[PDB]
């Protein structure tokens, strides 16, 4: 991805977009009960903690574009992945406006709390004033579609979240690209059935894990991965995607029956953005935040890995490449050992910056003991080995509980953490509950005991 130009929004006919400048994050009742080092990300150029230009840091993710066209290996990757998706019999029909708006089997309704994007965000008009979940009314929406059309600018927001000290000082805050409600609705109508098919089919056929339930899905994964596992991390995956990857994606879509609406992918690839009082144009780069983002990033990941394997290991048998992606995150396997370091090398030529799985310093062999997916390890249950525990380390959880974005959601926030933490074992879980209950706020929460979560887990399969 590469920013073509950037300039005052007024010069191109756009209003200044006002965005929050103060974080909603504040020390929670457990701030000093648990250890942590993360703080709220910088949200403005005038933040006292900044040790470098803010605007420069937040846009540096656009490292540029390394490839213009779709080469021989990419076409091969496209044919193989498309043929594989072909076996799911995905309904290629367009999804009606009502379902695209309020949901249907395999697709949740539109999130009524997130931004409505441009121009609504500039007219002070919110989603709540456009759709009614009880009515499933599509009259206002329709009227808005006809009035403002599609292919509207995306609104760039800084993500209000916890970041490390380094990332705070280096102004490395992440950005959200809120697309207009019109495009979101248009895209969910165009790809609604594709999204549904993926959500209902997490695994090695879609090569996607979006819409999955770790508690249940973890037990299915091992029986889907071949003998040798391999994985690696990406640096600025979304922003690094070159236009060629979007073209490769459209080819996949064409081959599976959606060639009818590949133009919507151009909207993602060559995108128009609004940030504060500036407007900019980007060539390449996936708009992190847009509807379908997760799925399209996952699809492109399936193309990338296949491409690097073809380029690096001619004669590789893609039919035995078993991988599951969730955006840039991936867990892959092959009957034979492969060199991630070599693949990483090939990756550079495709505009991808690949590094050792889980911040390792060197490319080490990935095993079932050290592999992670969505920050979770895999651990067989001591009593019933066929049941696999998704284990997220307590560090992440400790960092999160020390802050709050709304005192009214303390119960939900802490319960959420509990559903992640109990998998670390009973000894650990109880220590966690005890600390929570060492302060008044914690003692007033209704939290599930270990044996309760274990029983609930077994009863969920």
Q: How far is the CB of 195 from Na ion (least distance, A)?
A: 20
Going residue by residue from 218 to 257, which x/- string records binding to Na ion, judged by CB under 5 A? ----------------------------------------
CA distance 292 to 327: 10
Considering only residues 266 to 305 of the shown chain, the ones binding Na ion according to CB under 5 A are 271, 282, 285
CB of 238 to Na ion, least distance (A): 9
* 160 in a known ligand binding site: no
Count of CB atoms within 10 A of residue 449's CB?
14
Q: Among residues 282 and 366, whose Cβ is nearest to Na ion? A: 282
Q: Which is nearer to Na ion, 115 or 271 (CB)?
A: 271
> What is the distance of C-alpha 310 from the center of its chain?
26
Annotated ligand binding at 111? The verdict is no
Give the CB-nearest residue to Na ion. Answer: 271
Q: What is the smallest separation between the CB atom of 268 and Na ion, expressed in angstroms?
A: 6
Instruction: Output the CA torsion 435→428→40→413 (10° steps).
Output: -70
Q: Does residue 417 touch Na ion according to CB under 5 A?
A: no
Instruction: Give the DSSP H or E segment for 244.
Output: helix 243-253
Q: Nearer to Na ion by C-beta: 206 or 242?
A: 242
Question: For residues 400 and 408, what is the distance between their CA atoms, to the nearest angstrom?
Answer: 16
Q: How far apart are CA 126 and CA 122, in angstroms?
A: 10
State which residue, 283 or 379, has the beta carbon closest to Na ion. Answer: 283
Minimum CB separation of residue 271 from Na ion in Å reads: 4
In sequence order, the 6+-apart residues with CB closer than 8 A to the CB of 158 are: 19, 41, 42, 43, 44, 58, 173, 174, 175, 176
Which two three-digit tokens encode residue 50?
A: 């900044």
Other CB atoms within 10 Å distance of the CB of residue 340: 23
Q: Tell me whether residue 183 or residue 215 sits nearer to Na ion (CB atom).
A: 183
Please, which of residues 431-460 interact with Na ion by CB under 5 A?
none
Whole-angstrom distance between the N-terminal and C-terminal Cα of the chain?
42
- By rule CB under 5 A, what count of residues binds Na ion? 3
Q: State in angstroms the smallest separation of the CB of 176 from Na ion.
A: 14
Q: How far apart are CA 398 and CA 417, in angstroms?
A: 9
Nearer to Na ion, 156 or 271 (CB): 271
DSSP string, 260-286: GGTHHHHHHHEEEEEETTEEEEEES--
**How far is Cα 292 from Cα 188, in angstroms, rounded to an integer?**
8
What are the residues whose beta carbons fall under 8 Å from the beta carbon of 214, sequence distance 6 or more? Answer: 374, 376, 390
Q: Which is nearer to Na ion, 23 or 65 (CB)?
A: 65
In the bound complex, what is the minimum distance in angstroms from residue 62's beta carbon to Na ion? 9
Q: In the complex, what is the shortest distance from the CB of residue 90 to Na ion, in angstroms, rounded to a whole number?
A: 25
Nearer to Na ion, 245 or 378 (CB): 245
Minimum CB separation of residue 239 from Na ion in Å reads 9
d(CA 223, CA 206): 16
CA–CA dist 274, 61 (Å, integer)? 17
Binding residues for Mg(2+): 233, 328
Binding residues: 233, 328
Which residues sit at the interface with Na ion, rule CB under 5 A? Answer: 271, 282, 285
């Amino acid at each position: 991805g590469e920013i073509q130009w950037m300039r005052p929004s007024k010069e191109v006919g756009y209003p200044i977009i006002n965005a929050p400048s103060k974080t909603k994050l504040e020390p929670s009742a457990f701030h000093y009960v648990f250890e942590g080092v993360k703080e709220p990300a910088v949200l403005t150029k005038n933040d006292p903690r900044l040790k470098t230009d803010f605007e420069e840091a937040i846009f540096s993710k656009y490292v540029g574009n390394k490839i213009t066209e779709v080469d021989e290996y990419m076409k091969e990757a496209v044919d193989h992945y498309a043929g594989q998706l072909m076996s799911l019999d995905i309904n290629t029909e367009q999804m009606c406006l009502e379902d695209a708006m309020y949901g249907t089997d395999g697709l949740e309704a539109l999130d009524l709390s997130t931004s409505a994007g441009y121009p609504y965000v500039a007219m002070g008009k919110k989603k709540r004033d456009i759709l009614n979940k009880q009515t499933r009314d599509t009259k206002e929406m329709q009227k808005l579609l006809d009035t403002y059309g599609i292919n509207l600018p995306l609104v760039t927001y800084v993500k209000d979240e916890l970041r490390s000290k380094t990332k705070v000082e280096q102004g490395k805050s992440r950005l959200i690209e809120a697309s207009s409600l019109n495009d979101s609705v248009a895209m969910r109508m165009a790809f609604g059935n594709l999204y549904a098919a993926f959500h209902k089919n997490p695994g090695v056929i879609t090569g996607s894990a979006v819409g999955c339930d770790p508690d249940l899905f973890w037990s299915k994964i091992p029986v889907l991965m071949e003998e040798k596992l391999f994985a690696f991390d990406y640096t600025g995956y979304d922003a690094s995607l070159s236009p060629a990857w979007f073209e490769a994606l459209k080819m996949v879509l064409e081959k599976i029956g959606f060639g009818d609406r590949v133009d919507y992918i151009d909207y993602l690839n060559h995108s128009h953005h609004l940030y504060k009082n500036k407007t900019y144009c980007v060539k390449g780069g996936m708009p992190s935040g847009v509807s379908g983002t997760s799925i399209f990033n996952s699809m492109i990941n399936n193309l990338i890995i296949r491409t690097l394997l073809l380029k690096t290991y001619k004669g590789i048998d893609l039919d035995h490449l078993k991988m599951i992606a969730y955006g840039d995150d991936v867990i892959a396997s092959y009957p034979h050992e492969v060199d991630a370091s070599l693949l990483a090398q090939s990756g550079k030529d495709y505009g991808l910056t690949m590094t050792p799985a889980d911040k390792s310093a060197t490319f080490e062999t990935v095993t079932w003991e050290n592999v992670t997916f969505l920050k979770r390890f895999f651990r067989a249950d001591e009593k019933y080995p066929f049941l696999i525990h998704p284990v997220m380390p307590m560090k992440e959880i400790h960092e999160s509980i020390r802050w709050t974005k709304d005192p009214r959601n303390t119960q939900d926030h802490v319960r959420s953490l509990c559903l992640l933490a109990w998998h670390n074992g009973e000894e650990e879980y109880n220590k966690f509950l005890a600390k929570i209950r060492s302060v008044p706020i914690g003692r007033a929460l209704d939290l599930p005991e270990y044996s309760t979560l274990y029983d609930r887990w077994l009863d969920s399969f």
